[PDB]
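Complex record, three chains
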Amino acid sequence: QREGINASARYPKNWVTTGDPAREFTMIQSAPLMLLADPDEFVSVQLA
Amino acid sequence: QNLADPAYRRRRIIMQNMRDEELAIAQVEEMQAVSAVLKGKYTMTGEAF
Amino acid sequence: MYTTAQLLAANEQKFKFDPLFLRLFFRESYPFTTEKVYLSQIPGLVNMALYVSPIVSGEVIRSRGGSTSEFTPGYVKPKHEVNPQMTLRRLPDEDPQNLADPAYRRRRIIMQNMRDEELAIAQVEEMQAVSAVLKGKYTMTGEAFDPVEVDMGRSEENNITQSGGTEWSKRDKSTYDPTDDIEAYALNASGVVNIIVFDPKGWALFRSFKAVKEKLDTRRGSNSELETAVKDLGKAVSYKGMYGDVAIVVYSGQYVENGVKKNFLPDNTMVLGNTQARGLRTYGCIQDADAQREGINASARYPKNWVTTGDPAREFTMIQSAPLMLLADPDEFVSVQLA
């Protein structure tokens, strides 16, 4: 939100945490909403 | 015969890990498409969600 | 109220510290890029060709060497607090006739913090040096730090003990000469030795023998010994004088533990040492992500200043390094346990 990228495909983010043990994370976050328009456009024939 | 510093090893680990996360995203992304045009229904359910 | 009482600077309160080891023996220092850092010691032995004339051609030469060992880690981690809420009050420094802001006072206390951290660095590194030239074996252990054992390669002839049935105690304080034992112990010294460092009390019963009396034993007796003692001032190193071909050294250096003092030497011990005994100040790599970011993993020391977010704004001071004090040849000293 601080960079105004509230909408995006993906979201990389690298960041190091302080403290007596030091260590850094690389992060990916996104909100996949994979959808298709018309369900009846395909017929799922379960073969046998 | 030719080593490096753990720093560039850390760079290698970072690049590899980025590659793995990108691959995991690309792979999990097809799950919803598979459900959608495999049944016309889909289940977005899993732990921490 | 109105006081106007000029009070100048206060005490300093430095107890004692004289390394004499990390200032005389370990003059070599090498950072690490790998955990497995190697050091070889060739056991060379070549004879002659006594009778061979250029008609009786015989044996050919043979190569020598092939002994090496490694010891990885080294470490230290002295972090301390910044105390942001106590920067308002004045220190024992910052005279009441001239005060200043707590922000620059924060800078001064940060200088104090880093200085005290380096004090701890010295006090711990000197214990490693004590292990090194005290046994030929070194054990770096503690809490949040697994034990690390380094058998430097010291031979048991270098771990002589006076213990027996005559050691020094029940000899003659007036006529007995301890020189014979001195040469006996210097025999298996793997080279010429010229420094015989004593304990603060180990030299007490040593000089109890009157065979020490006739020795030079002058405050102006040597050349390297005097300058070494001078640059090692602190009234913890006492170069007594010359013992003929060797010099009398009495080392009484100390370090603070958590809160208590301790002498770097035991009560009754002595070392057969050479002035050119070469040692290592070799350093490891920093096990911190921040250091790797600029690739400063390989370094002697590693300062760091940082601050945490949130409602309590807390700054901190940090030093990381991996001290791995070592020696080229442990056999050059002989740790005689005096008794």
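Note: DSSP finds five helices and 15 strands in chain C.
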